[PDB]
């Protein structure tokens, strides 16, 4: 969208991001806590975790929490154990941005790695949806939860090259499709598609592409924004294209 | 698919057929072999296999070999060896038909058991492109190698209930597009949504639900064999209802 929001967007809202320590997540974190939200940062790394939450501190006053989880290892138990945690300290979820996410290889299907291939399932599909079984509970404390996947233009047309994480980002649009149904009246259940954006992961899938042409994350957000705040309230089962 | 093939469609034909003693996947067999095809029956359980060959061999006057595969413990190793072992009796496959898979928990999303999400997930996504990979060079010997997946209608829109099928069955679809793009003018890719059939799988789904409302696996196979024989050559990248509105 060409989203131009009320800079207290997202005040008084409590949303949890994943991958929040690098890339897209470490964006939509900051962006989000810029807009009013209180925010919760879920990675795999301390250290990074801590810096992002000090940087957020700095450009807002406020002190976001957060914890470890690695989806590519977590159990289900794992997982309930952390909403656990999240619930002793906070009285609801808002919303989950899922932005955690495993490229793996991309090659053609003869020469994709099984290992990666599962290891990208784990992450992209499993794990993501254990965790969010995990966290249904707080969101339907929120006035209006809004649950937010990652998906990608192979989550909707499969292509060449593409592979695991394909196959992982149409199972990601199923998944977003079964819960929109079951959660009808209560949630917002939704995909991002951030498109083609300068990260790490983008220069993994074309390591002889110019980095210089892509859009920053900072770019895409509009549609991150857009999702959690209330003029999405009425949106629920559809995925997005965060430029096309 | 209203379909009347020539009944020596499959002559000459060697189609290996996965999940064999199941309902859908023994008539597949029994169906491709009354058309011709040298049909090789896959299972985890041997003693089934080793039934619906010999009830094809009765009915036919042909009898399917048989191997052995778990799809929820092997490994990708187990898939070559099988290959391997199909390499020494055969010289190609004409077509795969991957019929194996799991159901697991029909029940919302919260309900779903995490341990049986990642036990379909690995059966019906993971495990059936591992196999796959282990086929390409096999299938690749055939004219024109025909590769099918079964998918379901909740692998083209999510319904409430149906949690890691779903999911599995969305998985499915992507991993059949990306196979028939890689593989355009050199395989035939596609899958194959059998609907509501009378089959344990669909009892466990619906377990109140009156079976006589529904078509048997005899009834839904024109669109199972219109895919493995020729008419089907210039098709790929498709999913099909065996059983249109």
């Known amino acids: 969208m060409h989203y131009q929001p009320k800079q207290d967007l997202l005040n008084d809202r ?23 939200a209180t925010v919760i940062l879920l990675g795999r790394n301390e250290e990074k975790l801590r810096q992002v939450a000090s940087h957020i501190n700095e450009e ?56 990666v291939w599962q290891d990208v399932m784990q992450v992209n599909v499993n794990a993501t949806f254990m965790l969010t079984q995990a966290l249904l509970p707080l ?25 695991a994480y394909a196959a992982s980002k149409f199972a990601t649009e199923g998944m977003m499709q079964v819960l929109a149904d079951e959660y009808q009246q209560r949630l917002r259940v939704n995909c991002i598609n951030p498109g083609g954006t300068r990260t790490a992961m983008r220069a993994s899938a074309f390591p002889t592409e110019d980095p210089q042409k892509l859009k920053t994350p900072a770019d895409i957000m509009p549609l991150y924004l857009w999702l959690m705040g209330d003029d999405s309230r009425r949106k629920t089962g559809m995925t997005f294209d965060a430029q096309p």
């Open 14 to 36: 409590i949303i949890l991001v994943t991958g929040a320590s690098d890339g897209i997540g470490r964006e939509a974190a900051m962006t989000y806590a810029r807009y009013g």
């Open 139 to 163: 969101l339907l404390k929120s006035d209006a939860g809004s649950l937010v996947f990652t998906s990608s233009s192979v989550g909707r047309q499969g292509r060449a090259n593409w592979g």
């Open 60 to 115: 807002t006053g406020r002190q976001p929490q957060w914890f470890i989880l690695d989806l590519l290892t977590c159990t289900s138990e794992n997982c309930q154990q952390l909403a656990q945690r999240i619930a002793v300290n906070y009285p609801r979820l808002d919303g989950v941005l899922h932005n955690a996410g495993l490229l793996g290889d991309v090659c053609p299907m003869s020469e994709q790695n099984p290992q």
